Each structure stands twice: as C-alpha cells, then as structure tokens.
Design a protein around this ligand. Structure first.
Ligand SMILES: Nc1ncnc2c1ncn2[C@@H]1O[C@H](COP(=O)(O)OP(=O)(O)CP(=O)(O)O)[C@@H](O)[C@H]1O
Ligand SMILES: [Mg+2]
Length: 321
C-alpha cells in the first residue's frame, strides 16, 4: 500500500499522544551519521550521546532517570550547542525541543524561583511540562547558585521535579546536557605567560576538582571533553555555513565557486582559540555576502552566472567566466 505512508500514521499517533514522530519512527540506529550531517568532528561527543541513547532504548538503564545526562567540557565555539540543537531536531522532530538555561542568570539565591516557580511553575518546570520530550541545555553549570545546582541533582536522581505548587513534572523523556569551559581560559593564560606544561595541567586539575565533585560526576552518563577544531574541520564548517547563501543564490541560478585560498581566508578569520568558530558567521557576512551584494546590485553578477571567488589584495575577489 503506497498512498498512505509511515509518516501519515505516525503523524496521527503523534498528535493524539504527544509522542514526537521521530520517537515513534525511531526503529525505522545510524544516529551518529545523522548527527554528523550538522556536527563536524567531536566524534567522541557524538558516540557518547548515541551510546547512551542506545542503552536507554534497549532497556538497560534505570527507567526513573532521564534518557541521558552529559557534561560537555572543553572550549567554547566548537560544537557543544550545535550538537544539542541537532540532537533535539533528530530525536524530537525540531530544534524547538531544545530548552536552554544560562546559569550566569542563576547565580543569586532567589533564582531558584525563576527555575521552579515563586513561593506561594517557573521557566524550566512549565517548559518541560508542555514539552516532556526535550533536550535541556544548562550552560556554565559551575556558575549556578548551590540552591539551583541542587535542583539539577533531583532531575538526575529522580527523573522528575516538583514545582512550587506541588505538582510533579516528568523528566524521564529528556536528555540533559551541561556545559562548562572551565580550564580553557587557564590553559590560554599559561600558554601566554609561558608556564611549563606541568603547571598548566596541575592548575586545570585543581579548578575541575574545586567545582566538580565525584558525587555529581558519578550521576552522569558521560563526561566529554570537546576538542579544538583542526584546519580541515573549520573548512568543512565554512561549507555548512555557506549552504543558506548558496540556496538563496540558486533561486537566481547563480553559483559560487570558491578557490582553496578563499575557503582558507574565511576559515582563518572565522576561528580562534578564544571564541572557537563563533566569529565565522559575521566574517562570511562581511567578507563575502556584502561585496557579493554590491556586485549583484551593480549588474556585474547576473542571473545564470557562475562566480569564482578568490583572494585578492584587499580581501576576496569575484570573477565571472
Ligand atoms: N563542530 C562543529 N560542527 C558544526 N558547526 C560548528 C561546530 N563548532 C562550531 N560550529 C559553528 O560555530 C558556532 C558556534 O558553535 P556552538 O554554538 O556549538 O558553540 P558553543 O555552544 O560552545 C558557544 P557558547 O559557549 O557561546 O554557547 C555555531 O553556529 C556552529 O554552527
Ligand atoms: Mg552554546
């Protein structure tokens, strides 16, 4: 039977139950390759997440806990959020299924009420109430007030939270992702001041031991250390970040052919150890989109054209065969 599809039936069941389509169609796995469509490198992170999901779906884990819980260590701008968003879209149909909580906004004692509700629901509890199938991302976890930190421990331990009214909110269908870049600025400080490797490594271990206790770490499925990106990995990210632009140009049958020097130009400006690849978006906007816009408006780049992008003296240069 060809007319009614698997997706048709899943859609009806999803609307009737609240269970996401991808969740119902999970069986019809190759989750790593799917996540890799959007996340370049961080192979260890990807396998950690997929392995935990496999253990849960196979019935090997405690049913009264989240699907998975992770701490993502390592530097900023190298894929922690891209993985969380991709995971949400892949497991739960959409990126809207990622809930982000910035712990720098939860540093003071009374922030607990922002999470679970004021004393006689709050941000987190109400969010998870309407979307039980969610990836919850807590950024800079070490900055949370102890009272806030304790509420996370309840989620990990019990797979649920009681809000400030007395109602239990279910977290058994969530994935928990905690992030911290602790250690990364310290390394940069030591490399700039010229400490021997030995002192840098000792100091990193010290700050980790100060903020993260074994009793906390033991609760997690995995601790993953994200790595700085290689030059080739940054080049692959350049290509991904150009997809939308390429799609827009394709409507006018315009194509963009970047030389290797041009791709390296964007890669070199769009990434550093301090911000990771966070700068790359506005580098592409300023170095490529803007002068390309001028050419299109000037009639120099026409519908149908293949445009070669190279490195000139003043930045990128555009030529039309
Ligand atoms: N490994 C990777 N694969 C694909 N894209 C990546 C990537 N690392 C970084 N990027 C791109 O660079 C940007 C920053 O990455 P991401 O947001 O994952 O880092 P982050 O979550 O550590 C920043 P913050 O610490 O500010 O939250 C994203 O838009 C992302 O698309
Ligand atoms: Mg992030």
């Amino acid at each position: 039977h060809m007319e009614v599809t698997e997706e048709d039936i899943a859609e009806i069941v999803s609307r009737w139950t609240g269970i996401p389509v991808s969740k119902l169609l999970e069986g019809e796995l190759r989750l790593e390759e799917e996540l890799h469509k959007r996340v370049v490198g961080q192979d260890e992170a990807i396998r950690a997440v997929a392995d935990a999901i496999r253990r849960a779906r196979a019935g090997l884990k405690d049913p009264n806990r989240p699907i998975g819980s992770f701490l993502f260590l390592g530097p900023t701008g190298v894929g922690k959020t891209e993985l969380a968003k991709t995971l949400a879209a892949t497991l739960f149909d959409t990126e809207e299924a990622m809930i982000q909580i910035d712990m720098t906004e939860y540093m003071e004692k009374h922030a607990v009420s922002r999470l679970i509700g004021a004393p006689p629901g709050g941000q987190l509890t109400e969010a998870v109430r309407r979307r039980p199938y969610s990836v919850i991302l807590f950024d800079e976890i070490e900055k949370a007030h102890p009272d806030v930190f304790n509420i996370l421990l309840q989620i990990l331990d019990d797979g649920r939270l009681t809000d400030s009214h007395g109602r239990t909110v279910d977290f058994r269908n969530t994935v928990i992702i905690l992030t911290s870049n602790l250690g990364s600025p310290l390394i940069l400080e030591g490399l700039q001041k010229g400490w021997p490797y030995e002192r840098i490594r000792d100091e990193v271990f010290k700050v980790l031991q100060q903020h993260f206790r074994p009793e906390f770490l033991n609760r997690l499925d995995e601790i993953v250390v994200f790595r700085p990106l290689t030059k080739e990995q940054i080049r692959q990210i350049v290509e991904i970040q150009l997809s939308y632009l390429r799609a827009r140009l394709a409507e006018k049958r315009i194509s963009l052919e970047l030389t290797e020097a041009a791709k390296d130009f964007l890669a070199e400006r769009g990434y550093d150890p301090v911000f990771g690849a966070r700068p790359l978006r506005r580098v592409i906007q300023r170095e490529l989109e803007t002068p390309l816009a001028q050419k299109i408006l000037a009639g120099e780049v026409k519908e149908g054209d293949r445009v070669q992008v190279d490195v000139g003296p003043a930045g990128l240069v555009f030529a039309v065969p």
